[PDB]
Write a protein that binds this ligand. Structure first.
Ligand code: SF4
Ligand code: FCO
Ligand code: F3S
Ligand code: CL
Ligand code: LI
Ligand code: MG
Ligand code: 3NI
Lengths: 268, 581
């Protein structure tokens, strides 16, 4: 049967979200593209360039007006009349608005599209602005993280295809399924936290026994994501498991919450 | 229209103007414009970076220990390479030496990135410039099997397999939902592979899209996650415990077994799928050994990479050679110094930035990142560029030069530098590769050569992964487990004022981060990134960068279908987020 049309556009970004997507272990990104959705526009993978790429974009948003999902990676800069990000000679924000107008719903992949991420960190030279501050008349599902977990991305996709509905979301638009709990709520080092067993400096005896990273600045206690349960790259690891505290990368403004190595101030 | 001469080229903007915006199958945002003459030959090429985020500005005032995490987000494709450059730079400034295992693990991280980034580029980015996917539908599955088996011992080659792949493509296309294949250049006269080779290549495109996900498991073990693994100033955070209580909480024998399993599989795939495919592309596209030469026979640059002696960044330590060649003089590989203010300089007279004097170049320790969107007289308006004005400012990319010379960086550059320094392994490999194609050495200096060198490098990196893993295991056997130095972790131990340079060879070429620390905070942080070199706009002398030079003099079969432009640009693996940062 026909597959759901998907248009994937890119603003200011580093492309980590697109890269995370192709890391998916199940379903493989190959199988998502071949069998689950129709990825009809995507600057990073598509054969067409320049005018041919413009023709694809125009044809798809026209033919499937009201019926395609818009995936967004990165964000629009408002500075310099939007010309910090230029697409087909015009501000990226114009392409974003045109694509959003015909979409049935929008997926804001990553902390960039959800919140701002690194380009929005102080002093935000380009006035990088998350999607939901520009597009105010469309369902937007925020899937934050820098990048989000590969198998979370593909699970969210399969949920929408299989159940023919958007996932239920929290008050911030994040899917409850993966963002309902804190990293710290499902962290395998929590026994050490509770016992006051902490890494105090890198590669100390505590580090070699996998003690808690709280005193090394772990932001797990204030961060909502699936890293400590679903884990990363086919369940191989996550930041804390490999010895570094959570940076807080799924949370709005995480870059400007003080040093990554400063302790969480008020643990909820 | 105007005409001028530079670097042996005649830059002429008379004639039809062609615009390609967006450039697709790259990372980030790029616009290209060319002029073509009455013979459809490119007489002018204009490289434009169409994005900027300003990491150099954002980094000011940050804790130097945090810098790697910020600058890692320059790019998620070459993920980790900016973190490595950052920790090197901060360690250089402060005066930190890391333990041997930390250095070995960092080398593993970089070699893992090379394998991953090169493999995915070859198939997912550049592949469709060479393989006509739609033409795969006309292939005979038995003849495809016979072709594959003539090229490689790779197991996956049955007629039934190629028939299954072809059938899946048939069903994918049949409903009219062509997705990433829609409105492509299929049928272009420059597609020269027979149908069996197109089916073989398409099968391998799918195999690579599946397999690349496994390579980065090495980053997950040592760095927590990929994309964007974690690092520390002073070493790595992945503490090791092999034979003591609590090894479940650290890098242990099971974690190392996983790493070894990935290394073996990665080498297998690169050696038996990517390498034969690259050579096959070479065999069927030999005229491309004479197209897209650009600066590769004039000026090439490598900083060098993979220090094998921990904390030693000298010629005797770096496993990947550094050096510069200028003026086509490959008999004299020149030493590079990243502190010398007369060597690396960046110009902005053709870029969207303010300098007090835009006619002079600034070494990164004197760098300025003051964005200034000022396109001047485009055809169009400030928010509707119909034609960039390459006589004034036309890019978010700064113009790096080395001793005032425009340089090419990347796999071909590195290969030429190693070859001409007399690296025995490189000479043997290059000579054997060109012999197999019955091409002269000069054939490497081309668009086809960039692709061949990239494949060569993926093979080299996969071999080095085992070398570094064995080095790590040797230390562990000798009871050397240290992964972090923390003597100078605390800001109270740092010089009040210091500066440092971190450098490496990222997949796309020479990378440097220049950092100045004052009173415990980043005072200045300037990046010059490989695609900054290659995608460079012009300088005050009108000298053109690697992309513009490689596009010069190129015949196009069908002006409105920019396949030759895409082939040459994609051969450099452009990363525009890197170039602009
Ligand atoms: S502070 Fe971090 S390492 Fe410690 S239990 Fe919480 S999430 Fe885990
Ligand atoms: N490779 C790579 Fe990215 C670029 N250019 C960096 O550094
Ligand atoms: S840094 Fe990000 S990847 Fe997960 S563990 Fe923390 S939310
Ligand atoms: Cl943010
Ligand atoms: Li002009
Ligand atoms: Mg820079
Ligand atoms: Ni990059």
């Amino acid at each position: 049967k026909p597959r759901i049309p998907v248009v994937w556009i890119h603003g200011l970004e580093c492309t980590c979200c697109t890269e995370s997507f192709i890391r998916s272990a199940h379903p493989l990104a190959k199988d998502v593209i071949l069998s689950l959705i129709s990825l009809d526009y995507d600057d990073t993978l598509m054969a067409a360039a320049g005018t041919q790429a413009e023709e694809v974009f125009e044809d798809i948003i026209t033919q499937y007006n009201g019926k395609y999902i818009l995936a967004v990676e990165g964000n629009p800069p408002l500075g310099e009349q939007g010309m910090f990000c230029i697409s087909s000679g015009r501000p990226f924000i114009e392409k974003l608005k045109r694509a959003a107008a015909g979409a049935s719903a929008i997926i804001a992949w990553g902390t960039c599209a959800s919140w701002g991420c690194v380009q929005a960190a102080r002093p935000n030279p380009t006035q990088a602005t998350p999607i939901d501050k520009v597009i105010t008349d469309k369902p937007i599902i925020k899937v934050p993280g820098c990048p989000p977990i590969p198998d979370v991305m593909s699970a969210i996709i399969t949920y929408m295809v299989t159940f023919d509905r958007l996932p239920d979301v929290d008050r911030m638009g994040r899917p409850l399924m993966f963002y309902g709990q804190r990293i710290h709520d499902k962290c395998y080092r929590r026994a050490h936290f509770d016992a006051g067993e902490f890494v105090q400096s890198w590669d100390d005896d505590a580090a070699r026994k996998g003690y808690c990273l709280y005193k090394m600045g772990c932001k797990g206690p204030t961060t909502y994501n699936a890293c400590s349960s679903t884990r990363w790259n086919d369940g191989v690891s996550f930041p804390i498991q490999s010895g570094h505290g959570c940076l807080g990368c799924a949370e709005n403004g995480f870059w400007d919450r003080g040093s990554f190595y400063s302790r969480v101030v008020d643990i909820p | 229209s105007t005409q001028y001469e530079t670097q042996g080229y005649t830059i002429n903007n008379a004639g039809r103007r062609l615009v390609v915006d967006p450039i697709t199958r790259i990372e980030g945002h790029m616009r290209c414009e060319v002029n073509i003459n009455d013979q459809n030959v490119i007489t002018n090429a204009v490289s434009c970076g169409t994005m900027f985020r300003g990491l150099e500005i954002i980094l000011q005032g940050r804790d130097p220990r945090d810098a790697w995490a910020f600058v890692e987000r320059i790019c998620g494709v070459c993920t980790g390479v900016h973190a490595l450059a950052s920790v090197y730079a901060i360690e250089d400034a402060i005066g930190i030496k890391v333990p041997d295992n930390a250095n070995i693990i960092r080398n593993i991280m970089l070699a893992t990135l090379w394998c991953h980034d090169h493999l995915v580029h070859f198939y997912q980015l550049a592949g469709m410039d060479w393989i006509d996917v739609l033409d795969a539908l006309k292939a005979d599955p038995r003849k495809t099997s016979e072709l594959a088996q003539s090229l490689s011992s790779w197991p996956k080659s049955s007629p039934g397999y190629f028939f299954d792949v072809q059938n899946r493509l048939k069903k994918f296309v049949e409903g009219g939902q062509l997705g990433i294949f829609r409105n492509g250049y299929w049928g272009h006269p420059q597609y020269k592979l027979p149908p069996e080779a197109n089916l073989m290549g398409f099968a391998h495109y799918l195999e690579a899209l599946d397999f690349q996900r496994e390579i980065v498991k090495i980053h997950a073990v040592f760095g927590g996650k990929n994309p964007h693994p974690n690092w520390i100033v002073g070493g790595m955070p992945c503490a090791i415990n092999i034979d003591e209580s609590g090894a479940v909480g650290a890098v242990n024998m099971e974690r190392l077994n996983l790493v070894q399993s990935i290394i073996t599989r990665t080498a297998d795939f690169i050696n038996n799928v990517m390498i034969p495919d690259a050579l096959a592309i070479g065999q069927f596209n030999k005229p491309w050994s004479e197209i897209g030469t650009g600066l590769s026979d004039k000026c090439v640059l490598s900083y060098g990479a993979f220090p094998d002696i921990a904390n030693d960044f000298g010629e005797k330590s770096l496993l990947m050679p550094g050096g510069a060649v200028i003026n086509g003089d490959f008999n004299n590989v020149l030493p590079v110094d990243l502190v010398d203010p007369q060597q690396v300089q960046e110009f902005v007279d053709h870029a969207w930035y303010r300098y007090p004097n835009d006619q002079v170049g600034r070494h990164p320790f004197d760098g300025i990142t003051d964005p200034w969107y000022n396109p001047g007289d485009v055809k169009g308006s400030d928010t509707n560029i119909q034609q960039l004005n390459e006589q004034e400012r036309y890019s978010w990319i700064k113009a790096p030069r080395w001793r005032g010379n425009a340089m090419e960086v990347g796999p071909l550059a590195r290969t030429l530098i190693a070859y001409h320094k007399g690296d025995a392994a490189t000479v043997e490999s290059v000579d054997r590769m060109m012999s197999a194609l019955n091409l002269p050495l000069s054939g490497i200096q081309s668009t086809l050569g960039r692709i061949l060198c990239r494949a060569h490098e993926a093979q080299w990196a996969a071999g080095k992964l085992q070398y570094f893993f064995d080095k790590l295991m040797t230390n562990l056997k000798n009871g050397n487990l240290a992964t972090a130095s923390t003597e100078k972790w605390e800001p109270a131990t740092w010089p009040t004022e210091c500066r440092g340079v971190g450098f490496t060879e990222a997949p796309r070429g020479a990378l440097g981060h220049w950092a100045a620390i004052r009173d415990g905070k980043i005072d200045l942080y300037q990046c010059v990134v490989p695609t900054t070199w290659n995608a460079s706009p012009r300088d005050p002398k009108g000298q053109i960068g690697a992309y513009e030079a490689a596009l010069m003099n190129t015949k196009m079969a069908i002006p409105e279908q920019p396949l030759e432009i895409l082939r040459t640009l994609h051969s450099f693996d452009p990363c525009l987020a890197c170039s602009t940062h």
